[PDB]
Design a protein around this nucleic acid. Structure first.
Lengths: 108, 108
DNA sequence: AACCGCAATTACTTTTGCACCAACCT
DNA sequence: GGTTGGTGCAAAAGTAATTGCGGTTA
DNA sequence: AACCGCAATTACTTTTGCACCAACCT
DNA sequence: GGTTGGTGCAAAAGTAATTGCGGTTA
């Protein structure tokens, strides 16, 4: 039955926060309306706390991801010193796979 | 202030319908919480009526779009009778632009 | 007070024409 | 140079959503 | 009864290695 | 044949969301 995205769930939290409900009250309303396990009290309090500060964005904060192992300036210098060089030759010197070279050359 | 998608708005309608609210009641709750012009009574009744039948999908029904002016079987036959023929030659015979021929040849 | 039929208006859908293009051909 | 398949994007051609007014049921 | 700090767990993010490939080269 | 740039996708390496338990304020 329950087909809602995280964004749709969070919009209902925001609606409920703006109606003046307490988070524990909103939790009960959501489990009654959509069924058990729709909302957790602690999660609703975590969101209400963000809303109460004026942060009404329903998105996650940005995640930087895996740190890059390639220095684009070094790659630029290796290419400028030898423009003939293949991706497999650059990869051996840079201790990466040639596909990482291919992908980073598209960036620069 | 108001940043919600149609899908987020519709999820709030569904929540409210499942809480046992009347559509005119939900309309007032949404305009009070998010501000004037957030919801219209007639629209909320149109959605509640779909929900009441058991249709709890928050998507629009599919739209077929512009009707196609090209017969793919004819295009297949023109190509099979003369494989040498260019998109501009096929377009002249089919009363379309060559780009429609290009696009429809990708389909088949 | 609430909902709904109806119809006018708005927003979406997919497809097409024209302008313009780069790679390949002549 | 010319030819060719291909794409960006506005206009086109459709269906379904949006919603104000008046009727009907409460 | 409700919220929150804290920490364990889960879900997401972007990047990389390896397997495998088709077009072009030798 | 071999070489080459390129992609699919699983594994990797990160940050932030999710949430149960115990403390604190009511």
């Amino acid at each position: 039955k329950m087909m809602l995205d995280k964004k749709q769930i969070r919009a209902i939290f925001l609606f409920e926060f703006k109606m003046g409900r307490k988070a524990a009250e909103t939790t009960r309303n959501m489990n009654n309306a959509f069924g058990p396990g729709t909302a957790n009290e602690r999660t609703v309090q975590w969101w209400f706390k963000k809303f109460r500060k004026g942060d009404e964005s329903l998105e996650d904060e940005e995640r930087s991801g895996r740190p890059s192992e390639v220095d684009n300036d070094q790659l630029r210098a290796i290419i400028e010193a030898d423009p003939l060089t293949t991706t497999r030759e650059v990869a051996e010197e840079m201790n990466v796979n040639h596909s990482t070279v291919v992908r980073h050359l598209k960036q620069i």
